[PDB]
Design a protein around this ligand. Structure first.
Ligand SMILES: N[C@@H](CC[C@H](O)[C@@H](N)COS(=O)(=O)O)C(=O)O
Ligand SMILES: N[C@@H](CC[C@H](O)[C@@H](N)COS(=O)(=O)O)C(=O)O
Ligand SMILES: [Mg+2]
Ligand SMILES: [Mg+2]
Ligand SMILES: [Mg+2]
Lengths: 330, 198, 198, 330
């Protein structure tokens, strides 16, 4: 059971990466191949691991080019018998936990936050957990502490407006690779890039903000709200939450492109990687301007609009670089 | 063909940024609640950073540590114009960290009215991986939270360099317009003729 | 606050671009009709530039003058990838001119798969004014036309420098994607340890 | 009589600048304050000095914020009588000339090209001309040479597909400042920038392509044509001709912004200037890819589309920097 994360990444990519590594899959190839933007109004939950997956499973959408699937489960009762049975069947449960109740988390008895970790062993008295999020931890915690975190009501917390008010609900994610992986050769990388670019350029449906036009509409709608209003507060909470894993995927996609640039010495992939990293970095400007407005009432609408506009321009430039990269491998 | 260049004697100009400190990124155990390195009220531990006003070197580059007050120990970037001594320069050196890695623009203003947008990348304060080939300035053992000292969680500050290619007299810089970016120190390195060795 | 510095002797790596020459920007009086510096078939006078294959310095920076053939004496920029000796570099130097002043990107490719887009401005060949703080490499007295040598019309070539801020091993460059831009010579300058004067 | 030009400029800005300097006006303020893009299908002439002026006079449109006017005149007969009368009235005639017939021009008896120069003195045997275009010339030429250039048929020349087939027609431009110049203070510069930005952002009503939306449509239209066709050749000849003085105005507007940045020590004006210069530089990529396609059959549709897309992005970025500049002076 391998600890895996990235400085732009959350427990969402981290826990899935651990599950993939256990089954001998390269998490950079699987989780880094897909690159998209989607926002469904009303869909977001106050959870570190929120990602808009519909109609795919959560793991399915995050690994769009692989036969990777997940199912959510709510465990009945007061014990961990379901997790014991899952482990005995060779499954690595990914548990929905509240950091407030995890002794090894900085948030312990301080900040409520909806989080994921891997459970890899259970005894009569201990649950062995793997959590790569800084500061990384792997080992036994008391059963009582695990149950407290797994059953947490995760109540609304003034100290965490982003990831509180989402009960753990004894939820856990089961992942499976249901067939053999595609060979990640030059032609496969070319097709992945072209499918990502085509999906970004597609005009979105009325009910879902997707790709480049969807990002434009989303940021215009966001910047139209008046700083400090309840409407703005709700929108900036959503922004910070949804943008974490969208930003994470941007960073992973850049790494995916760099890895294949090195493998085949194709500079177009490294150049594309720079454009994609510029989008990852552009998300920082937008979500942190949003965060400080939301939390500290640092209202800078000109800054938010500036970062929003820079992010769109960087995405435009990245898509053009990616088409040159696809041509270099196809 | 490979040919030897000449040794040179560039000058370091350590920019006094005490008047521009607008944010608390560093706390002692007595004022943990003052931390504003990020939205979560984290901060660098003062006990693992240099003394205010002290001369330090990072990878041979000299910096003056900011003379902090209760309300500022670094520049949180808001497009501040920083006056620099007029001269011909090669490099800007910043001690910096970002709330997640990000990249932006430092504008160099020249006496003829030209302004050059210069690309700058700054890596994460949160146990960061350098994304722009920066050097490590400080990697602390601990991080400050609003209510506690966190053991075994490094807070990372980076030495980042920005080229000033224009052959011209620079008079000022504009820092990025990004709340994510923090500048702890600023040192300019003057131009120095380097030629084919005789 | 000012402190004297000392930088070790760097190395100059003069890039052999003879294999990339794809355009005639220079003519002698006997082949005026071969000039393709611009759409009008102008060219630099051969008599007002160095001998092919010669070693020159421009503002102290060494360059090898291209071993021209009938069909090439410079790189008209089409995003050519140029292999460079792997190493840690501070500066790219180009001898260059543009069909009207323009700005574009030189990409630096690193061993770890990172690539940095480096802004490059190149000023006009046609009695140009430097717009990017370049140094004059050559300012001729005359210009070649398809049918005559034009007296009292300078053809201008520029020395431009491009910073390589990333601390990492660079393996190749990409030249700009612009038919307007002409590269006559390319020299890399290695990183050199800088420190306080003892 | 002052020689004035810029390396991005043509005889259009040059001759007008000489006329303005004679009347004690700053050509950087008068010709540099305006910044726009306009293209009317079928309006262009094969002349170095073509600029879409309607409904304003030529000088009027090029000095949009000043009480500057021009009138075109066509002189009958075979002499220079009308020009002598113009000089006696304190006017500097700007004569339509063919470079083919000007002994001091590189094009002399080699290339036909529709050009402008200033006439400042006439004797019985000589016309004194001022032409700042490299290589700059100021002095007497024989009457016969001037008449040959001023009356030139300027026939279609396969060595000049851009500026030939436009007879000189003994045409001359009369320019006048019809009132005191506006005082160029901080508030005036602010109003100038805001009006330029508003005009760039305004959607065109009909067939005339204006501002950023017009530029997008114009470049899309250009890139849609099949390289090597008569239609593409006509469009690329138009592109090179109209874009010269549009690019020239971009360069002069950047200089105007730099000048006021220095005067008032306002760095936002210098930053905006860099943005506007990036548009001036962007035009180089577009018009030189076009020129080599038109003249040397260097068909590179991907390159032209790439430069066109970059030019639009640079204009977008320039408009935002200008609004920040306007805020700093207003
Ligand atoms: N680093 C991420 C996530 C932060 C966590 O949600 C903590 N506020 C609480 O949990 S803890 O155990 O990581 O401290 C960010 O900056 O958003
Ligand atoms: N430099 C401008 C203008 C070129 C002229 O039209 C000449 N081809 C003929 O006139 S000459 O007397 O200047 O040579 C450009 O590059 O388009
Ligand atoms: Mg699937
Ligand atoms: Mg192939
Ligand atoms: Mg008017």
């Amino acid at each position: 059971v391998e600890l895996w994360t990235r400085d732009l990444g959350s427990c969402l990519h981290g826990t899935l990466a651990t599950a993939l590594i256990r089954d001998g899959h390269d998490p950079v190839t699987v989780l880094g191949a897909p690159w998209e933007f989607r926002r469904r109004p009303g869909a977001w939950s106050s959870e570190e691991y929120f990602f808009f997956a519909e109609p795919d499973s959560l793991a399915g959408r995050l690994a769009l080019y692989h036969p990777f699937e997940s199912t959510w489960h709510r465990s009945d009762g007061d014990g961990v018998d379901d997790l014991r049975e899952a482990l005995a069947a060779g499954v690595l449960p990914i548990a929905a936990v509240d950091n407030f109740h995890l002794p090894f988390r900085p948030a312990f008895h301080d900040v409520h936050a909806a989080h994921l970790l891997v459970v890899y062993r259970i005894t009569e008295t201990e649950v062995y957990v793997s959590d790569a999020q800084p500061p990384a931890f792997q080992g036994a915690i008391p059963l009582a502490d695990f149950l407290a975190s797994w059953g947490s009501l995760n109540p609304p917390d003034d100290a965490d407006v982003f990831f509180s008010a989402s009960p753990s609900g004894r939820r856990w994610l089961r992942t499976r690779m249901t067939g053999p992986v595609p060979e990640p050769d030059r032609h496969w990388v070319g097709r992945v890039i072209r499918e990502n670019v085509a999906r970004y350029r597609q005009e979105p449906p009325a009910d879902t903000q997707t790709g480049l036009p969807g990002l434009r509409r989303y940021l215009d709608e966001l910047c139209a709200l008046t700083p400090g209003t309840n409407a703005a507060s709700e929108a900036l909470s959503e922004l910070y939450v949804i943008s974490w894993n969208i930003q994470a995927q941007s960073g992973l996609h850049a790494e995916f492109l760099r890895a294949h640039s090195v493998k085949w010495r194709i500079p177009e992939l490294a150049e594309a990687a720079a454009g994609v990293d510029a989008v990852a970095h552009g998300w920082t400007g937008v979500r942190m301007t949003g965060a400080h407005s939301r939390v500290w009432q640092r209202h800078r609408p000109a800054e938010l609009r500036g970062h929003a506009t820079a992010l769109v321009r960087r995405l435009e430039a990245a898509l053009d670089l990616l088409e040159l990269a696809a041509d270099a491998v196809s | 063909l490979t040919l030897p260049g000449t040794a040179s004697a560039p000058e370091f100009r350590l920019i006094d940024i005490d008047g521009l400190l607008n944010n608390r990124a560093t706390t002692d155990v007595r004022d943990l609640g003052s931390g504003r390195l990020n939205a979560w009220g984290n901060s660098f531990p003062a006990a693992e950073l240099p003394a205010p006003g002290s001369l330090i070197t990072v990878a041979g580059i000299p910096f003056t540590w900011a003379n902090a007050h209760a309300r500022g120990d670094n520049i949180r970037c808001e497009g501040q114009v920083v006056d620099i001594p007029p001269g011909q320069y090669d490099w800007i050196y910043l001690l910096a960290a970002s709330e997640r890695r990000s990249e932006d623009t430092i504008w160099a203003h020249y006496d003829d009215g030209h302004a050059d947008p210069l690309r700058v990348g700054i890596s994460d304060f949160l146990d960061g991986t350098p994304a722009f080939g920066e050097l490590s300035a400080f990697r602390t053992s601990r991080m400050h939270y609003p209510h506690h000292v966190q053991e075994g969680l490094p807070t990372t500050m980076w030495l980042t360099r920005v080229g000033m290619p224009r052959h011209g007299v620079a008079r000022s810089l504009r820092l990025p317009r990004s709340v994510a970016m923090h500048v702890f120190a600023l040192t300019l390195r003057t131009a120095a003729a380097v030629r084919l060795a005789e």
